[PDB]
Enzyme design. Structure first.
Site, short mmCIF file in Angstrom:
data_model
loop_
_atom_site.label_atom_id
_atom_site.label_comp_id
_atom_site.label_asym_id
_atom_site.label_seq_id
_atom_site.Cartn_x
_atom_site.Cartn_y
_atom_site.Cartn_z
N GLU A 172 -31.60 -14.56 -16.06
CA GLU A 172 -30.58 -15.38 -16.72
C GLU A 172 -31.08 -16.26 -17.83
OE1 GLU A 172 -27.52 -15.23 -16.15
OE2 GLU A 172 -27.26 -14.12 -14.24
N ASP A 221 -22.04 -16.30 -22.66
CA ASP A 221 -22.71 -15.27 -21.91
C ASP A 221 -22.50 -13.90 -22.53
OD1 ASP A 221 -20.36 -14.38 -20.82
OD2 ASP A 221 -20.89 -14.75 -18.75
N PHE A 259 -24.55 -13.20 -7.59
CA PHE A 259 -24.66 -14.33 -8.51
C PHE A 259 -24.14 -13.97 -9.87
CE2 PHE A 259 -27.03 -18.25 -9.73
CZ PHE A 259 -27.06 -18.11 -11.12
N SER A 262 -21.61 2.34 -2.70
CA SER A 262 -23.01 1.97 -2.79
C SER A 262 -23.41 1.21 -1.55
CB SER A 262 -23.22 1.06 -3.98
OG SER A 262 -23.01 1.82 -5.15
#
Ligand SMILES: Cc1ccc(C)cc1
Ligand SMILES: [Cl-]
Ligand SMILES: [Cl-]
Length: 162
Positions: A11, A20, A104, A117
């Site tokens: 990040e 972002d 997150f 998955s």
């Protein structure tokens, strides 16, 4: 290596409001502030989070405080999620860090739509899960990061981070 160091690599760290990868106002270590296009809305959310009139800027300490809260929250989010918990409980320590990273980044909602998955991971079919995870908007949008996380699930080592 651990979850904090891993996420700090993925990040970065920015002390001034920024946009972002999706164009949303963020600060510190990937702390999303708002999806609204309004900078004021973002500064207001920022002040409410820090508890002070920041003017769009925070200190390193404040960034690290948001980070700690965010990591904690993700973990707890996972543990509270009926779809997620069982998968997370089945994993080893390294792979759990990869699960936390995705939550997150995308939210427990986002990750909870990787049903297939999830099932592969729970069954410990590593190579297959890796292939399945890559068939996603997530991978197509942030390929280098997705590749690191995917390698992590696949190998159960920190190789992608060294
Ligand atoms: C807990 C967990 C979250 C997300 C994935 C993709 C796997 C496990
Ligand atoms: Cl907050
Ligand atoms: Cl990327």
């Amino acid at each position: 290596m651990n979850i904090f160091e891993m996420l700090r690599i993925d990040e970065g760290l920015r002390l001034k409001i920024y946009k972002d990868t999706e164009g949303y106002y963020t600060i510190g270590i990937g702390h999303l502030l708002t999806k609204s296009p309004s900078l004021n809305a973002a500064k207001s959310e920022l002040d409410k989070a820090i508890g002070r009139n920041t003017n769009g800027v925070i200190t390193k300490d404040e960034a690290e405080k948001l980070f700690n809260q965010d990591v904690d929250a993700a973990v707890r989010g996972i543990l509270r999620n009926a779809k997620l918990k069982p998968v997370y409980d089945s994993l080893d320590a390294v792979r759990r860090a990869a699960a936390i990273n995705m939550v997150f980044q995308m939210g427990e909602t986002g990750v909870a739509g990787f049903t297939n998955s999830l099932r592969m991971l729970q069954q410990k079919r590593w190579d297959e899960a890796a292939v399945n995870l890559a068939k996603s908007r997530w991978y197509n949008q942030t390929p280098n990061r997705a590749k690191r996380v995917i390698t992590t699930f696949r190998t159960g080592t920190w190789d992608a981070y060294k």
